[PDB]
Structures are given as C-alpha cells and as structure tokens.
Amino acid sequence: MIQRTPKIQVYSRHPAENGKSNFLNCYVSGFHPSDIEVDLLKNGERIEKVEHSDLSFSKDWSFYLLYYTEFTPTEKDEYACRVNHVTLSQPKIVKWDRDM
C-alpha cells in the first residue's frame, strides 16, 4: 500500500502581537493513512485541551486536519507542533515562526 507523509504548517490565526490572545494552529495535510498524532508544545511541553477538526480529505483522497488552541504569544515563549505518522521514523517538530 502507498503511504504519503504529512505536510505540516504551524501558524497563528491573526498576526502575532506579544501579550495579545490569538490561536495557534497546526495544519497537517496530504497524508495517508489517516492515523496521525499531533501535539502542540509550549517550551517543549504538551499544551493540554488542544482541539481538532473532524477527519476530511482532498480530491486526491489524502487527509487533512487542523489542530488548534488559544495562546498568547510572547517574545520568549517557544511554540511548536510535534507530528508522528507511519511515514516518519521519529516525530517531526516544526517550530512556530511568527513570520511564516
């Protein structure tokens, strides 16, 4: 069976302003099979109560999901998304960069 590794973007709902509440998003897409493990991290620890969209898929049958949580960005705090999937030998961490 053919497998497809997820694309991953980590980003905020609104342009980040330090001290102002916002949403942190991790969008995983283009993957198969559908089981996937996604964490949002604040200084390397799992953020609790992250929500996610219901499983859906694109024209080419590959899957996509949005994981999100409320967050307040600061100068110092480091945010990231950790993704694991059968196509990955180890979990992939993508750092949040407010300029991307």
């Binding site: 497809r4 198969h32 099979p33 089981d35 969209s53 590959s62 899957f63 949005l66 300029d99 991307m100």
Partner: protein, 276 residues
C-alpha cells in the same frame, strides 16, 4: 456564482480494537456544515454552521439514520474488500466515499460526483454521465457488475440531479449571509533580512473566503514563477484562509518587485509593494 455540495465519508478498521471508526462531514463550498463520528457517546449528526441549525428534528433524525446506516455498510464493505484483495484480518484498512453536486449561478446541475477509494487508491467512480462506471481494477469490476445489475447509477443520477441540487439551493438561500459572501484578503508585505545583500519579501493574504486565490510576485512587471516560494493555502480556523508568497531580492531593489492578488472578494485585483 457557482457552488458545490459534498459529503465525505471515511471508515478505518482497527482489528483487535473493536469495530471500525466512521467519520462523515458535509460541506457547501469551503464551509463545513454537518458532522458525524461513530465514536461519540450517543452519536448524532450535528450542525457545524448556523444556517443548518434551523432544520427541524425530522431533518436531524433522518440524517442520523443515514449516517448510522453508512457506518454499518462500511463495516460490511471493509470485510468484503478483504476478500476481494486476499488480505488478512490483521491490518488496518481505509474506505472512503465522496458524493455531491456542482451548480452554476442559475442553480442548474453542472456536474454530479460519486466515488470510492480503498487504502487511498481509486476503487470505483461514477462517470460524468451519471450512467456508467470506471472500475480501477478487477476487484472493483466485481462491484461494478453488482451495481450495474442493481441499476445503482440510475438511483444516483436521480439523487444528484434532484435532491442534491434542490437542497444545495435551499442551503445557499438559508445561508446567504455567509455562503454568498466572498471575503477579500487583507494583504501586506513584510521584509526579512537574510544578509547585508539580500532579503525575503513575503506577501501575505489573510482572512479570505473562499479558499480560491491567486498570489504572484513580479519583477519589473515580469512573472517570477520559478523563484517564488508559495505555501499551501491553510485554514485560519474561523472559516477563512491564509496564504503567502515570497521572493528573495537584492538589497535596495525592492521597489522593482510587486505582489499581485486576485480574489472573488476584491473590488479589483491588487498590486502591492513593500513599504518601508
């Protein structure tokens, strides 16, 4: 404007860990409006857009019956597909089905769709004629024979030309405040030094609906397709979408580069530059 309705369905088996998980969602255009998850406590189809909430109890009861029925048929189909592909009972497998309809500005059927995939690969699709089938392999040809014998395509044609279009039109009316509103991108250009000699110009498009957009960079009015980094369009989480396009530019040459934005919501296409 033209519009679409789609129902998406996924079952994933989990041998030794109970029955398959079934998730189905419905969309009008790029708007999610209904969902059902078989693992929820006493599962019901639930609304996900304000304009569907007004449908009465009988609507939700019938939807829930169909969703529960589809979970059952998907369980059966996953067992059948193991046989068709001589597969053991040990592995997880995936069954997907999509169907729905496209309509033009005047509400007429443009195209109907009904297709299945197994383990991420095309399985069987209803053709555009809504009368004949495309089977991907000899297993799907078994299904094709069964569905031809039962005149399934005729059933689907009737649904797709009829109820699919009629209910899509009803939803477009009831949801006219949102479904028939295109929100233009809010745009700006940022500047990111790489060295003393070059920097990245990033052209942002935020808060737009629907997802369709065109974002390009030009240099002296000439397209820079090969040297533009373009990220995949991504959901903001509030119904809207985001995208950006970036080019690497020599220091001081920034005014020669223009970002061009086309979107249904814009009064006119935009031309933007970095503004120090």
């Amino acid at each position: 404007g033209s519009h679409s309705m789609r129902y998406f369905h996924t079952s994933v088996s989990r041998p030794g860990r109970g029955e398959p998980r079934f998730i189905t969602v419905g969309y009008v255009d790029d708007t999610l409006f209904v969902r059902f998850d078989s693992d929820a406590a006493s599962p019901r189809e639930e609304p996900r857009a304000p304009w569907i909430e007004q449908e009465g109890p009988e609507y939700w009861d019938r939807e829930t019956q169909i969703c529960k029925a589809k979970a059952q048929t998907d369980r059966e189909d996953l067992r059948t597909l193991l046989r068709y592909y001589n597969q053991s009972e040990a592995g997880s497998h995936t069954l997907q089905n999509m169907y729905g309809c496209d309509v033009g500005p005047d509400g007429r059927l443009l195209r109907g769709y009904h297709q299945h995939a197994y383990d991420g690969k095309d399985y069987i699709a209803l053709n555009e004629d809504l009368s004949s089938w495309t089977a991907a392999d000899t297993a799907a040809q078994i299904t094709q024979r069964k569905w031809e014998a039962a005149r399934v395509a005729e059933q689907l044609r009737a649904y797709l030309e009829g109820e699919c279009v009629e209910w899509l039109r009803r939803y477009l009316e009831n949801g006219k405040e949102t479904l028939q509103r295109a929100d233009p991108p809010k745009t700006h250009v940022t500047h990111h030094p790489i060295s003393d000699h070059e920097a990245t110009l990033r052209c942002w498009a935020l808060g737009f609906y629907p997802a369709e957009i065109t974002l390009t960079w030009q240099r002296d009015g000439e397209d820079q397709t090969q040297d533009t980094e373009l990220v995949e369009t991504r959901p903001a989480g509030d119904r809207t979408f985001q995208k950006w396009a970036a080019v690497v530019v020599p220091s001081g040459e920034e005014q020669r580069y223009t970002c061009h934005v086309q979107h249904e919501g814009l009064p006119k296409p935009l031309t933007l530059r970095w503004e120090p």
